[PDB]
Amino acid sequence: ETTALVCDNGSGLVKAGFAGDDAPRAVFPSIVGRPRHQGVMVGMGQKDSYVGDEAQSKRGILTLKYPIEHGIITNWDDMEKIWHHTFYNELRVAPEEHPTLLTEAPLNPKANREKMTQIMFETFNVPAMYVAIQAVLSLYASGRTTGIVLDSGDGVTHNVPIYEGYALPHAIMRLDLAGRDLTDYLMKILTERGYSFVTTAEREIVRDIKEKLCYVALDFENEMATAASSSSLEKSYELPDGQVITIGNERFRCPETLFQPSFIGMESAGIHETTYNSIMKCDIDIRKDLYANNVMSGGTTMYPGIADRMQKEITALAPSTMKIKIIAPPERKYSVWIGGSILASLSTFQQMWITKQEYDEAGPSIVHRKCF
Amino acid sequence: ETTALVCDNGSGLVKAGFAGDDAPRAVFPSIVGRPRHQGVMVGMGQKDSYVGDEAQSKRGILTLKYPIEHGIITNWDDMEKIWHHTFYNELRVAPEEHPTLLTEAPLNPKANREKMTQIMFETFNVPAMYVAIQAVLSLYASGRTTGIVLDSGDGVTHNVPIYEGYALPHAIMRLDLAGRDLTDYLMKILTERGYSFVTTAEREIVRDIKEKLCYVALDFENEMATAASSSSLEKSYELPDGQVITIGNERFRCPETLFQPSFIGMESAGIHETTYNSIMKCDIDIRKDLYANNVMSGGTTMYPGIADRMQKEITALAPSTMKIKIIAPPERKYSVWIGGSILASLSTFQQMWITKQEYDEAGPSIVHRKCF
Amino acid sequence: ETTALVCDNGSGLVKAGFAGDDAPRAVFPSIVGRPRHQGVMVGMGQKDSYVGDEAQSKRGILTLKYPIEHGIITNWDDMEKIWHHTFYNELRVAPEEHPTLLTEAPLNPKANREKMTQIMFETFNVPAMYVAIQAVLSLYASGRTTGIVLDSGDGVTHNVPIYEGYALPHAIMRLDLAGRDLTDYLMKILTERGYSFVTTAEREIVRDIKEKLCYVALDFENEMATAASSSSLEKSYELPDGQVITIGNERFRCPETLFQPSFIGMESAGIHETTYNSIMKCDIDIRKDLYANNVMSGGTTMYPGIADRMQKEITALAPSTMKIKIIAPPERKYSVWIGGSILASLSTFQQMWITKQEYDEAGPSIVHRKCF
Amino acid sequence: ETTALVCDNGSGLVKAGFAGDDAPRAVFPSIVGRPRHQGVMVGMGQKDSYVGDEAQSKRGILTLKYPIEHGIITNWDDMEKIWHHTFYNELRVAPEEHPTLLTEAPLNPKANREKMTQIMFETFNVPAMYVAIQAVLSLYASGRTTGIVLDSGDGVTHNVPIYEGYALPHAIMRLDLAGRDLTDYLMKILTERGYSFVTTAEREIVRDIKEKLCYVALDFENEMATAASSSSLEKSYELPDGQVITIGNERFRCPETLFQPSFIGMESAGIHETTYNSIMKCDIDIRKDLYANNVMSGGTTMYPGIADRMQKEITALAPSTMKIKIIAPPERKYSVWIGGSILASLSTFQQMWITKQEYDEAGPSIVHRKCF
Ligand SMILES: Nc1ncnc2c1ncn2[C@@H]1O[C@H](COP(=O)(O)OP(=O)(O)O)[C@@H](O)[C@H]1O
């Protein structure tokens, strides 16, 4: 035992690797697919369930299901499939010899992390393991100790403020609007063009349309009006069956749901008011260094022109005398894993594991103690 | 028991052999002939009914009847004659010792296959037997597991799409236009030349004219116009009684019924639109590998220039960005039997038989379970 | 030009008249007779060939030949004689001034109608002409637009179904059994009584025996058994030379060939199964109004008791829930000409002619276009 | 101008009448039929296309096509024929003098309603017109202001929840399974009995079989097992040509597609889970009054025993502490038109029209404003 696995199971995409590297060696969608047709050939009981990209490669004949929804593991039997796939089929590593570092979102149910720990100890028998917080690990990546991290992933969007080492948990804001809810809204606003995507396979096509043609408009009604002369903004996409679709003002209406959650019928505030309300709940003296450090993480923060709209629209809320600075690293998509590969290689951390025997005498509630 | 019989009873031509060989050892027309004149000699009660080629050799004095029409066995007493002829007079094999593999078309009546099984168990007492699907066995021949098989035989034309082992039965398209309906249309369009074929014996002469002089025009009205200078296209045929007939633009009008079913007063679509409508009913992601694998089977797919017209006329329907590939093996006429000789020699299949005793306790509905 | 000639050249009897009248003014047998003995008087080169009733009046010294057989003109030089006789010697009309309306049977050779048109334009130089279909004109007579017409003439028997104006050409059934084949069978079954008719002159005597003493038995074996007490059914006929013949059960065996074509060694179905198979080839919704309209035409449908046997024996085939109605007009013998005298006097038809000049620039294939 | 036309063009059946009455004075199938045979009579260019019941009366010779599919008008030239037929040939009304009230399904393409408005103003020049939502008008009929309307018609099935006047558009669920897809599945499961319906005319026969012999089984496998003793459940139907067919367990397998969309190879949920998922997407406090008001509309909700299965199978999903009440009015088949005849006679609505001049200065996008 000299190296430690770092496994970030996001709600839509698993990223696993070794502690020490600057990039995960395994990045694959956290999907489990079951065949839904007959299978007339002789490969009948052959691969009764697929995981990873075989779930995505053969997705034309499968029902795809995500075991994680809103950062909460809803299907515990598929999560074991995905973990078994990561350890054995993707990293090619015996879990017996390496401590593992998992991550999860704040304000999750207590039973989620407990069952995580129980599975990791009593099924993979890892020597040690540690469950970190996804918004703390995004500061380890940026080499900071101060900032308010807005981590918008695939299931959950959370703002976490952190002063010089100290987190203020009474100002952590969680919101259940993320990338999957934008995929769902794009699937719905595309019907008014005539395109109908219903299957779970075509959901993965709309996700790819979104990751390629969607951007965040710096001003919404202004772009909505310049979309009336609907040729300077329409992009065309090529479906897998050769058909081409022409998406116009849906390119910025889909990510506007981040700033107008009323589009999908949610009574909440945008990610710009949730991050402002989180700074205004912190102490009056740290309030100035949180404006100057707005670290963004997760894939849903990779829309072209999201850091400019955040910077423009928080400045409209904050007092006009000090500066707002949105720090968007170019690799923020993996910014949670990088931090995990950092925290796990620090010598000062080598004593903050949870050892198998320590888990024995203390029970599955031992994981709740670890700095909460 | 070490070898298994493979008996493909098409609607117009029986092909039987042993599982393991690469060609059937028995290929004969599935006809039953009854004498229709007096018989003044002493061979009066001698061979009151003929089957096979004696039905075809002595066809000048017989009424010929096909027991199968449109893949449906309409005369159950003649089918037993044909089976008894295949087992005893053609393969020279006691059915008691060999399991048999029959085939039938999709979307047939349920009673057809049930009565098949009942006859094969309670009259020939085969040890085991299995009823496969004719469009799945055409992929076993081509060594594929993906493709849309267009199997045009003598009574039925069906498109069946099959992704990587899995069939999509909601897109199977059956059409009751096949080789016999083209023989009938050629018998009718030949009257405008003056030639009148009416008897069931002369039907078998028009079938031979069709199998020798008929082709599929790559463009219909273009060839129909180049047939006005009616000497560069007219072929002559020699009847059995020495007379010669001169067939001209009937050489491509007869197989055009496959692409224009309105010629025989049918409100349907050609085999090019039925195969396109079958791919467009499949899932959007498998839709690309079905264009690149259009396996053709059956004798009615042996007209010179049918794979080029299919490839040319599906490309006019599919999106212009990906390739259409019609895979026409040179022995596709037996492509359903070869597959049966393959599936029956696989060890993984040796447990998918239906044993006589298994048929006893379960009843004749046991055959409907077998992967449907 | 104000009136149009209507010339129906049947295969055995020409009926010509003027469009507008309700009966043809010229009805004569379509026979050409050549003298076959020496002619010792001085009228040597006097009338080297006879046509019409002089062919029939002087038939004791002539070889009689029909130029039309099975609705197909086999002797093109005698058909010109018959047409020249109709126009000049029977109607007494210059063809130059009147358009003509010819008729022919369905499913005839294409060259027949083309040569008809060529002769009528380049020999008689009619201004206009039109070639209609004999089974459509039988509905114009009955004032109907729906029904299945069974037109049994002297050479051909065809069933043609016609819904509300629209013909279904894929269900037209032609059969080459007609009145001449019944004359031939009566000539043969009369030998077992001892009477031998061989000459073409005595063929015209057997035809007259048939038209007077023959009927259709409502039940065949029943009448065949009541013919054993062979006095309640035997009728006597007086030959031209004063001899009397006694015909018994040949009175209903000759017309039974219409319902049992196996009598003359034909492998076909009766006129009752050919008309039932023609309705069952039509669409399922028009199938009900074709049972209720079975219009009969032609002379061969004038046997006493043929409409009752048709009505009785189709009812045995059709489902027992709806009614069969055989509509036998009392003048059906001319029912094809009446229709022609109707269609030719309709103003909506005056533009559907084929004008001499229109035939010039289009060629003899112009006549194939006319609603086929 | 004192009365207003109410024209509900469903995807399979047009219902038009006057605002104020309690029933439409015009109910006819929205079909356009083109003759597909020759037409040998003189009524050649006579009624080159039929609409309404002449499309259905003469359907034995026509190709029938629905201009609307899944609530989307696909053939804009036939929809004008159907509208011209409704106004002039069915209501006998000059459109110039009456405002009209059209309806359409939710989540349709934007261009559909725009082209509707454009045709109604620039072709029929109605003074005013209004396009309502089909699920709101079903509450006007029931005299309610609260409920979740499940409107299953011929092309589309939509759940729309409506609290006390306010609709929640983020929970509207549309599904493209409706009566036509059940007709298509019945056409397919009838082949295993031997009955083959292919034409568009026989599609209208299978629709009539479905509307008369089909019911919804309260428990599926239980009825499927009691269908093994297949005489206590088999009903016989009489085809138009007198033949009788015996339909057994297809009587409840066809409407089971509403609750098991996997039968036709759709990856969706039944109408019982789509209506439960729509209530669970609404706010937690209105959730109780939506269970107690499940208003059903459309013809596809007229199967015997559908309101009991819905009530039984939602109760299995909802919490067991409160009551589920399916409100199925006895005239729900017209429940969308009645509402239109109500909303159009309300004085508070007389100012919510779209006047011709108001459409002039605002363009065809004026219709999108009207409460969306
Ligand atoms: N380039 C991109 N532009 C917009 N959205 C993206 C992009 N890449 C990924 N996404 C969205 O981000 C999600 C993945 O983000 P990630 O942070 O990996 O989620 P998780 O934290 O659950 O692993 C995907 O669901 C996708 O919809």
Ligand SMILES: Nc1ncnc2c1ncn2[C@@H]1O[C@H](COP(=O)(O)OP(=O)(O)O)[C@@H](O)[C@H]1O
């Ligand atoms: N060389 C050929 N060209 C065109 N048609 C052919 C040819 N050979 C056979 N056929 C047609 O194909 C039919 C036989 O096809 P096959 O696939 O053997 O039918 P089945 O599946 O019923 O056995 C015959 O009816 C014949 O009309």
Ligand SMILES: Nc1ncnc2c1ncn2[C@@H]1O[C@H](COP(=O)(O)OP(=O)(O)O)[C@@H](O)[C@H]1O
């Ligand atoms: N009264 C009758 N009874 C039976 N057969 C008749 C009668 N009159 C004529 N025929 C037969 O019908 C034939 C004439 O029918 P017709 O319809 O005039 O023929 P075509 O259509 O060729 O003119 C004759 O050959 C004759 O044998």
Ligand SMILES: Nc1ncnc2c1ncn2[C@@H]1O[C@H](COP(=O)(O)OP(=O)(O)O)[C@@H](O)[C@H]1O
């Ligand atoms: N009594 C019935 N039982 C079952 N289905 C019916 C019945 N009546 C009509 N239908 C089905 O409902 C459809 C008509 O429903 P309707 O609500 O009028 O459709 P639309 O909204 O398109 O007008 C028809 O296609 C028919 O298949």
Ligand SMILES: [Mg+2]
């Ligand atoms: Mg994450």
Ligand SMILES: [Mg+2]
């Ligand atoms: Mg075959």
Ligand SMILES: [Mg+2]
């Ligand atoms: Mg005639």
Ligand SMILES: [Mg+2]
């Ligand atoms: Mg409706």
